[PDB]
Design a protein around this ligand. Structure first.
Ligand SMILES: *[C@@H]1O[C@H](CO)[C@@H](O)[C@H](O)[C@H]1NC(C)=O
Lengths: 98, 48, 130, 49, 98
Protein backbone atom coordinates (compact mmCIF):
# COMPACT_ATOMS: atom_id res chain seq x y z
CA UNK A 1 0.00 0.00 0.00
CA UNK A 2 1.41 3.39 -1.08
CA UNK A 3 -0.32 6.23 0.75
CA UNK A 4 0.36 9.42 2.68
CA UNK A 5 2.69 8.88 5.61
CA UNK A 6 0.92 10.90 8.29
CA UNK A 7 -2.07 8.52 8.09
CA UNK A 8 -0.28 5.17 7.81
CA UNK A 9 1.90 5.70 10.89
CA UNK A 10 -1.09 6.54 13.05
CA UNK A 11 -3.07 3.63 11.62
CA UNK A 12 -0.23 1.11 11.88
CA UNK A 13 0.29 1.97 15.54
CA UNK A 14 -3.34 1.59 16.62
CA UNK A 15 -4.26 -1.81 15.18
CA UNK A 16 -5.10 -5.03 17.01
CA UNK A 17 -2.40 -7.68 16.75
CA UNK A 18 0.37 -5.27 15.73
CA UNK A 19 0.72 -7.21 12.48
CA UNK A 20 1.29 -4.18 10.21
CA UNK A 21 4.54 -2.23 9.90
CA UNK A 22 6.03 0.54 7.78
CA UNK A 23 9.07 -0.47 5.78
CA UNK A 24 12.37 1.04 6.83
CA UNK A 25 11.04 1.75 10.34
CA UNK A 26 9.65 5.14 9.42
CA UNK A 27 10.87 5.68 5.86
CA UNK A 28 9.62 8.61 3.77
CA UNK A 29 10.70 9.55 0.26
CA UNK A 30 9.45 12.97 -0.90
CA UNK A 31 9.30 15.11 2.23
CA UNK A 32 6.60 17.78 2.14
CA UNK A 33 4.27 19.08 4.85
CA UNK A 34 0.66 19.86 5.67
CA UNK A 35 -0.63 23.41 5.90
CA UNK A 36 -3.43 25.96 5.85
CA UNK A 37 -4.31 27.20 2.37
CA UNK A 38 -5.10 30.92 2.09
CA UNK A 39 -6.46 32.96 -0.79
CA UNK A 40 -3.77 34.46 -2.98
CA UNK A 41 -2.07 37.62 -1.69
CA UNK A 42 -4.24 37.82 1.42
CA UNK A 43 -3.45 40.20 4.24
CA UNK A 44 -3.72 37.42 6.80
CA UNK A 45 -0.77 35.41 5.47
CA UNK A 46 1.69 37.48 7.51
CA UNK A 47 -0.02 36.78 10.85
CA UNK A 48 -1.18 33.15 10.61
CA UNK A 49 2.33 31.79 10.04
CA UNK A 50 3.78 33.77 12.95
CA UNK A 51 1.12 32.35 15.26
CA UNK A 52 1.94 28.76 14.29
CA UNK A 53 5.67 29.24 14.86
CA UNK A 54 4.92 30.38 18.41
CA UNK A 55 3.14 27.11 19.23
CA UNK A 56 6.48 25.38 18.72
CA UNK A 57 8.06 27.66 21.30
CA UNK A 58 5.79 26.87 24.24
CA UNK A 59 5.58 23.18 23.34
CA UNK A 60 1.82 23.11 22.79
CA UNK A 61 2.30 21.54 19.36
CA UNK A 62 4.70 18.94 20.74
CA UNK A 63 2.21 17.51 23.24
CA UNK A 64 -1.02 17.57 21.22
CA UNK A 65 0.24 14.68 19.10
CA UNK A 66 0.61 12.78 22.37
CA UNK A 67 -3.18 13.20 22.69
CA UNK A 68 -4.43 12.19 19.22
CA UNK A 69 -1.55 10.38 17.50
CA UNK A 70 -0.36 7.64 19.85
CA UNK A 71 -0.50 3.87 19.66
CA UNK A 72 0.25 0.73 21.66
CA UNK A 73 2.05 -1.43 19.10
CA UNK A 74 5.52 -0.15 19.89
CA UNK A 75 7.82 -0.26 16.86
CA UNK A 76 11.01 -0.66 18.89
CA UNK A 77 13.70 -3.38 18.92
CA UNK A 78 11.77 -5.14 16.10
CA UNK A 79 9.88 -7.60 18.28
CA UNK A 80 9.62 -10.89 16.41
CA UNK A 81 7.19 -12.85 18.62
CA UNK A 82 8.85 -16.22 17.99
CA UNK A 83 10.00 -17.54 14.62
CA UNK A 84 8.09 -20.83 14.25
CA UNK A 85 10.93 -22.23 12.17
CA UNK A 86 10.20 -24.02 8.90
CA UNK A 87 11.99 -25.86 6.11
CA UNK A 88 13.39 -22.62 4.73
CA UNK A 89 15.36 -21.52 7.79
CA UNK A 90 17.48 -24.69 7.84
CA UNK A 91 18.34 -24.71 4.17
CA UNK A 92 22.10 -25.14 4.49
CA UNK A 93 21.98 -28.16 6.78
CA UNK A 94 19.84 -30.04 4.28
CA UNK A 95 22.55 -29.04 1.79
CA UNK A 96 25.59 -30.06 3.84
CA UNK A 97 24.88 -33.77 3.42
CA UNK A 98 24.01 -33.11 -0.21
CA UNK B 1 26.56 43.10 3.25
CA UNK B 2 24.54 40.01 2.30
CA UNK B 3 21.48 39.18 0.21
CA UNK B 4 20.90 35.49 0.93
CA UNK B 5 21.84 33.01 3.65
CA UNK B 6 22.66 29.49 2.46
CA UNK B 7 23.58 27.39 5.49
CA UNK B 8 21.90 25.33 8.20
CA UNK B 9 19.49 27.84 9.73
CA UNK B 10 16.69 26.82 12.05
CA UNK B 11 13.34 28.60 12.16
CA UNK B 12 11.90 30.26 15.24
CA UNK B 13 9.48 33.04 16.08
CA UNK B 14 12.06 35.70 16.96
CA UNK B 15 13.95 35.42 13.68
CA UNK B 16 10.79 35.28 11.57
CA UNK B 17 9.87 38.85 12.57
CA UNK B 18 12.50 40.43 10.33
CA UNK B 19 13.14 38.10 7.37
CA UNK B 20 11.50 35.36 5.30
CA UNK B 21 12.49 31.70 5.18
CA UNK B 22 10.90 30.14 2.08
CA UNK B 23 10.41 26.40 2.77
CA UNK B 24 12.72 23.80 4.25
CA UNK B 25 15.43 21.64 2.79
CA UNK B 26 14.81 18.78 5.19
CA UNK B 27 13.10 18.24 8.52
CA UNK B 28 14.96 17.51 11.75
CA UNK B 29 14.81 18.29 15.43
CA UNK B 30 17.62 18.07 17.97
CA UNK B 31 18.90 15.45 20.42
CA UNK B 32 21.66 14.60 22.91
CA UNK B 33 24.77 12.47 22.44
CA UNK B 34 26.91 10.80 25.11
CA UNK B 35 29.91 8.50 25.03
CA UNK B 36 29.40 4.79 24.48
CA UNK B 37 29.88 2.14 27.18
CA UNK B 38 30.96 -0.72 24.87
CA UNK B 39 34.32 -0.90 26.69
CA UNK B 40 32.19 -2.18 29.58
CA UNK B 41 30.67 -4.91 27.42
CA UNK B 42 29.79 -8.42 28.60
CA UNK B 43 32.99 -10.41 28.07
CA UNK B 44 33.47 -14.18 28.30
CA UNK B 45 35.94 -16.75 29.59
CA UNK B 46 36.13 -20.49 30.25
CA UNK B 47 35.86 -20.35 34.05
CA UNK B 48 33.02 -17.82 34.11
CA UNK C 1 -39.64 26.42 13.38
CA UNK C 2 -37.97 29.53 11.97
CA UNK C 3 -38.27 30.91 8.45
CA UNK C 4 -34.47 31.28 8.37
CA UNK C 5 -32.21 28.25 8.44
CA UNK C 6 -29.27 30.44 9.53
CA UNK C 7 -29.26 33.90 11.06
CA UNK C 8 -28.63 36.73 8.57
CA UNK C 9 -25.20 38.31 8.72
CA UNK C 10 -24.76 41.75 10.25
CA UNK C 11 -13.22 40.95 7.29
CA UNK C 12 -13.30 39.31 10.71
CA UNK C 13 -16.13 36.99 9.61
CA UNK C 14 -14.22 34.38 7.59
CA UNK C 15 -15.43 31.19 5.95
CA UNK C 16 -13.61 27.85 6.11
CA UNK C 17 -13.82 24.63 4.11
CA UNK C 18 -12.86 21.23 5.51
CA UNK C 19 -12.68 17.55 4.57
CA UNK C 20 -13.30 14.53 6.80
CA UNK C 21 -10.70 11.76 7.23
CA UNK C 22 -8.10 10.40 9.69
CA UNK C 23 -7.83 11.48 13.36
CA UNK C 24 -7.07 14.96 12.02
CA UNK C 25 -10.76 15.64 11.29
CA UNK C 26 -13.58 13.48 12.68
CA UNK C 27 -17.32 13.85 11.97
CA UNK C 28 -19.87 12.76 14.56
CA UNK C 29 -23.66 12.94 14.47
CA UNK C 30 -25.52 15.42 16.65
CA UNK C 31 -26.82 14.55 20.10
CA UNK C 32 -30.53 13.63 19.83
CA UNK C 33 -31.37 14.90 23.33
CA UNK C 34 -31.15 18.57 22.32
CA UNK C 35 -30.03 18.78 18.69
CA UNK C 36 -26.81 20.68 19.42
CA UNK C 37 -23.11 19.90 19.37
CA UNK C 38 -21.83 18.92 22.81
CA UNK C 39 -18.71 20.12 24.63
CA UNK C 40 -15.33 20.13 22.84
CA UNK C 41 -16.78 20.44 19.34
CA UNK C 42 -17.19 23.10 16.65
CA UNK C 43 -20.37 23.33 14.55
CA UNK C 44 -20.14 22.46 10.87
CA UNK C 45 -22.95 22.40 8.32
CA UNK C 46 -23.14 20.02 5.37
CA UNK C 47 -24.65 20.69 1.96
CA UNK C 48 -27.20 18.19 0.62
CA UNK C 49 -30.76 20.56 2.04
CA UNK C 50 -28.64 21.64 4.99
CA UNK C 51 -28.04 19.32 7.95
CA UNK C 52 -26.21 20.19 11.14
CA UNK C 53 -23.20 18.08 12.10
CA UNK C 54 -20.43 18.01 14.70
CA UNK C 55 -16.74 18.25 13.77
CA UNK C 56 -13.80 17.50 16.06
CA UNK C 57 -10.25 16.22 16.01
CA UNK C 58 -6.60 17.16 16.28
CA UNK C 59 -6.52 19.55 13.33
CA UNK C 60 -9.55 21.50 14.55
CA UNK C 61 -7.81 21.99 17.90
CA UNK C 62 -5.35 24.13 15.96
CA UNK C 63 -8.07 26.32 14.46
CA UNK C 64 -9.31 27.14 17.97
CA UNK C 65 -5.94 28.41 19.21
CA UNK C 66 -4.96 30.28 16.04
CA UNK C 67 -8.28 32.11 15.74
CA UNK C 68 -8.17 33.08 19.42
CA UNK C 69 -4.76 34.76 19.31
CA UNK C 70 -5.31 36.65 16.04
CA UNK C 71 -8.96 37.33 17.02
CA UNK C 72 -11.13 36.44 14.04
CA UNK C 73 -14.28 34.37 13.53
CA UNK C 74 -15.32 31.43 11.36
CA UNK C 75 -18.03 28.87 10.65
CA UNK C 76 -16.91 25.59 9.10
CA UNK C 77 -18.70 23.70 6.38
CA UNK C 78 -17.75 20.40 4.77
CA UNK C 79 -17.25 20.14 1.02
CA UNK C 80 -19.55 18.28 -1.37
CA UNK C 81 -17.48 17.90 -4.57
CA UNK C 82 -14.84 15.20 -4.55
CA UNK C 83 -11.56 14.69 -2.73
CA UNK C 84 -8.88 17.21 -1.71
CA UNK C 85 -8.66 18.38 -5.30
CA UNK C 86 -7.58 17.43 -8.80
CA UNK C 87 -7.11 19.57 -11.90
CA UNK C 88 -9.27 18.46 -14.83
CA UNK C 89 -9.44 20.49 -18.06
CA UNK C 90 -7.89 23.47 -16.29
CA UNK C 91 -10.46 23.54 -13.48
CA UNK C 92 -10.06 22.99 -9.75
CA UNK C 93 -12.47 21.04 -7.55
CA UNK C 94 -12.55 20.02 -3.92
CA UNK C 95 -11.06 22.15 -1.17
CA UNK C 96 -8.67 23.79 -3.63
CA UNK C 97 -11.62 24.28 -5.96
CA UNK C 98 -13.46 26.44 -3.43
CA UNK C 99 -10.58 28.80 -2.60
CA UNK C 100 -9.78 29.70 -6.21
CA UNK C 101 -13.48 30.48 -6.74
CA UNK C 102 -13.40 32.82 -3.69
CA UNK C 103 -16.35 31.01 -2.10
CA UNK C 104 -14.31 29.82 0.90
CA UNK C 105 -11.33 32.16 1.61
CA UNK C 106 -9.48 29.52 3.66
CA UNK C 107 -9.08 25.74 3.87
CA UNK C 108 -7.87 23.78 6.90
CA UNK C 109 -7.49 20.08 7.50
CA UNK C 110 -5.21 17.59 5.74
CA UNK C 111 -3.69 19.08 2.58
CA UNK C 112 -0.41 18.22 0.92
CA UNK C 113 2.01 20.83 -0.41
CA UNK C 114 3.47 20.58 -3.90
CA UNK C 115 4.45 22.83 -6.77
CA UNK C 116 1.23 22.53 -8.76
CA UNK C 117 -0.98 23.79 -5.92
CA UNK C 118 1.25 26.80 -5.24
CA UNK C 119 0.33 28.32 -8.60
CA UNK C 120 -3.22 29.04 -7.39
CA UNK C 121 -3.26 29.41 -3.60
CA UNK C 122 -0.66 30.20 -0.93
CA UNK C 123 0.29 27.98 1.99
CA UNK C 124 1.90 28.65 5.35
CA UNK C 125 4.65 26.98 7.37
CA UNK C 126 3.94 23.24 7.79
CA UNK C 127 2.95 22.01 11.23
CA UNK C 128 3.52 18.25 10.75
CA UNK C 129 5.81 16.18 8.55
CA UNK C 130 4.50 13.85 5.85
CA UNK D 1 13.93 11.22 21.27
CA UNK D 2 13.36 14.25 19.08
CA UNK D 3 11.80 17.02 21.15
CA UNK D 4 11.64 20.22 19.05
CA UNK D 5 11.11 19.68 15.34
CA UNK D 6 11.73 22.38 12.73
CA UNK D 7 13.62 22.68 9.46
CA UNK D 8 16.60 24.42 7.93
CA UNK D 9 15.60 27.01 5.37
CA UNK D 10 17.06 29.52 2.95
CA UNK D 11 16.71 32.99 4.45
CA UNK D 12 16.52 36.26 2.55
CA UNK D 13 16.01 39.94 3.25
CA UNK D 14 12.34 40.81 3.63
CA UNK D 15 10.45 41.73 0.46
CA UNK D 16 13.29 40.99 -1.92
CA UNK D 17 12.10 40.23 -5.48
CA UNK D 18 12.89 36.51 -4.99
CA UNK D 19 10.57 35.79 -2.03
CA UNK D 20 8.26 33.49 -3.95
CA UNK D 21 10.29 32.55 -7.04
CA UNK D 22 12.96 30.61 -5.13
CA UNK D 23 10.77 28.46 -2.90
CA UNK D 24 9.41 26.76 -5.99
CA UNK D 25 12.77 25.26 -6.96
CA UNK D 26 13.34 24.00 -3.42
CA UNK D 27 9.80 22.66 -3.39
CA UNK D 28 9.93 21.19 -6.90
CA UNK D 29 13.29 19.50 -6.34
CA UNK D 30 11.67 17.19 -3.79
CA UNK D 31 9.48 15.59 -6.47
CA UNK D 32 12.38 14.83 -8.80
CA UNK D 33 14.22 13.10 -5.97
CA UNK D 34 17.14 15.46 -6.52
CA UNK D 35 17.11 16.23 -2.80
CA UNK D 36 17.50 12.50 -2.21
CA UNK D 37 20.65 12.10 -4.31
CA UNK D 38 22.35 14.90 -2.43
CA UNK D 39 21.35 13.10 0.77
CA UNK D 40 22.96 9.75 -0.01
CA UNK D 41 26.20 11.33 -1.27
CA UNK D 42 26.87 13.75 1.59
CA UNK D 43 25.10 12.40 4.69
CA UNK D 44 24.73 8.62 4.95
CA UNK D 45 27.34 6.03 4.02
CA UNK D 46 29.52 3.33 5.62
CA UNK D 47 29.56 3.34 9.42
CA UNK D 48 29.71 1.18 12.52
CA UNK D 49 26.24 0.96 14.06
CA UNK E 1 -31.16 24.82 33.69
CA UNK E 2 -27.51 25.64 32.96
CA UNK E 3 -26.05 23.05 35.33
CA UNK E 4 -28.05 20.04 34.07
CA UNK E 5 -27.11 20.39 30.41
CA UNK E 6 -24.20 18.90 28.46
CA UNK E 7 -23.95 22.03 26.29
CA UNK E 8 -21.39 24.36 27.82
CA UNK E 9 -23.66 27.24 28.79
CA UNK E 10 -21.82 29.90 30.77
CA UNK E 11 -22.77 33.20 32.37
CA UNK E 12 -20.73 36.15 33.59
CA UNK E 13 -20.93 39.89 34.30
CA UNK E 14 -24.47 39.75 35.64
CA UNK E 15 -25.64 43.35 35.98
CA UNK E 16 -28.30 45.02 38.13
CA UNK E 17 -29.24 48.69 37.87
CA UNK E 18 -31.14 50.60 40.57
CA UNK E 19 -33.98 52.55 38.96
CA UNK E 20 -35.46 53.48 42.35
CA UNK E 21 -33.77 56.69 43.50
CA UNK E 22 -33.51 58.06 39.93
CA UNK E 23 -30.55 60.25 40.87
CA UNK E 24 -29.75 60.72 37.18
CA UNK E 25 -26.13 59.67 37.67
CA UNK E 26 -24.17 57.48 35.26
CA UNK E 27 -24.19 54.50 37.65
CA UNK E 28 -25.84 52.60 34.81
CA UNK E 29 -23.11 53.54 32.33
CA UNK E 30 -20.30 53.02 34.84
CA UNK E 31 -21.57 49.54 35.72
CA UNK E 32 -21.95 48.51 32.07
CA UNK E 33 -18.36 49.44 31.17
CA UNK E 34 -17.17 45.93 32.13
CA UNK E 35 -19.32 44.16 29.54
CA UNK E 36 -18.61 41.82 26.64
CA UNK E 37 -20.27 38.96 24.70
CA UNK E 38 -22.57 39.32 21.66
CA UNK E 39 -25.80 38.36 23.48
CA UNK E 40 -27.29 40.63 26.15
CA UNK E 41 -30.58 39.93 27.94
CA UNK E 42 -33.00 42.68 28.96
CA UNK E 43 -36.01 42.66 31.30
CA UNK E 44 -37.75 46.01 31.79
CA UNK E 45 -40.96 47.91 30.98
CA UNK E 46 -41.81 49.86 27.84
CA UNK E 47 -41.96 53.29 29.48
CA UNK E 48 -38.65 52.89 31.33
CA UNK E 49 -36.88 51.11 28.46
CA UNK E 50 -36.26 54.23 26.36
CA UNK E 51 -33.85 55.53 29.00
CA UNK E 52 -32.05 52.16 29.07
CA UNK E 53 -31.13 52.10 25.38
CA UNK E 54 -30.04 55.76 25.33
CA UNK E 55 -27.23 55.25 27.83
CA UNK E 56 -26.37 51.84 26.38
CA UNK E 57 -26.48 53.11 22.79
CA UNK E 58 -24.33 56.09 23.80
CA UNK E 59 -21.46 53.71 24.59
CA UNK E 60 -22.11 52.03 21.24
CA UNK E 61 -21.84 48.33 22.09
CA UNK E 62 -25.10 47.70 20.25
CA UNK E 63 -24.52 48.43 16.54
CA UNK E 64 -23.00 45.47 14.70
CA UNK E 65 -21.79 42.55 16.81
CA UNK E 66 -24.34 42.64 19.64
CA UNK E 67 -27.85 41.19 19.60
CA UNK E 68 -30.52 41.95 22.21
CA UNK E 69 -33.59 39.84 22.97
CA UNK E 70 -36.50 41.12 25.06
CA UNK E 71 -39.46 39.27 26.65
CA UNK E 72 -43.08 40.04 25.80
CA UNK E 73 -43.24 42.86 28.36
CA UNK E 74 -41.64 45.42 26.02
CA UNK E 75 -44.15 44.89 23.23
CA UNK E 76 -47.01 47.37 23.62
CA UNK E 77 -49.73 46.28 21.22
CA UNK E 78 -47.30 45.86 18.28
CA UNK E 79 -49.13 48.75 16.56
CA UNK E 80 -46.74 51.59 17.43
CA UNK E 81 -42.96 51.27 17.73
CA UNK E 82 -41.36 53.79 20.11
CA UNK E 83 -37.99 55.15 19.04
CA UNK E 84 -34.57 54.33 20.56
CA UNK E 85 -35.10 50.62 19.85
CA UNK E 86 -31.85 49.36 18.30
CA UNK E 87 -32.00 48.11 14.74
CA UNK E 88 -32.62 44.39 14.33
CA UNK E 89 -34.24 43.72 17.70
CA UNK E 90 -35.58 40.16 17.94
CA UNK E 91 -38.18 39.42 20.60
CA UNK E 92 -41.15 37.22 21.45
CA UNK E 93 -44.70 38.09 22.45
CA UNK E 94 -48.14 36.55 22.74
CA UNK E 95 -49.64 35.66 19.36
CA UNK E 96 -51.73 38.45 17.83
CA UNK E 97 -52.14 38.17 14.06
CA UNK E 98 -53.46 34.59 14.17
C1 LIG F 1 10.23 33.95 -11.81
O1 LIG F 1 10.38 32.63 -12.31
C2 LIG F 1 9.93 32.50 -13.66
C3 LIG F 1 10.01 31.03 -14.01
O2 LIG F 1 9.11 30.70 -15.06
C4 LIG F 1 10.77 33.38 -14.58
O3 LIG F 1 10.27 33.29 -15.91
C5 LIG F 1 10.74 34.82 -14.10
O4 LIG F 1 11.65 35.61 -14.86
C6 LIG F 1 11.10 34.91 -12.62
N1 LIG F 1 10.94 36.27 -12.14
C7 LIG F 1 11.77 36.84 -11.26
C8 LIG F 1 11.45 38.25 -10.87
O5 LIG F 1 12.73 36.24 -10.81
Amino acid sequence: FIYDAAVLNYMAGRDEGCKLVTIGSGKVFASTGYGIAIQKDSGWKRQVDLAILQLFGDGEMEELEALWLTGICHNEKNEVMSSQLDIDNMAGVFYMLG
Amino acid sequence: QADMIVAPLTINNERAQYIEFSKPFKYQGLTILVKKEIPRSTLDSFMQ
Amino acid sequence: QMKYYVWPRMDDHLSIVTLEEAPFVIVESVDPLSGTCMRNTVPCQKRIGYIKKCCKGFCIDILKKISKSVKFTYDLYLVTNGKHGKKINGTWNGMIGEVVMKRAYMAVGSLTINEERSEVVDFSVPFIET
Amino acid sequence: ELFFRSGFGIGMRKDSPWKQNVSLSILKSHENGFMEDLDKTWVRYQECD
Amino acid sequence: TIENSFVGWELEEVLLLDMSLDDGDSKIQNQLKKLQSPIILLYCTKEEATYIFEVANSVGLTGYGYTWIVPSLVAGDTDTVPAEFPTGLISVSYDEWD
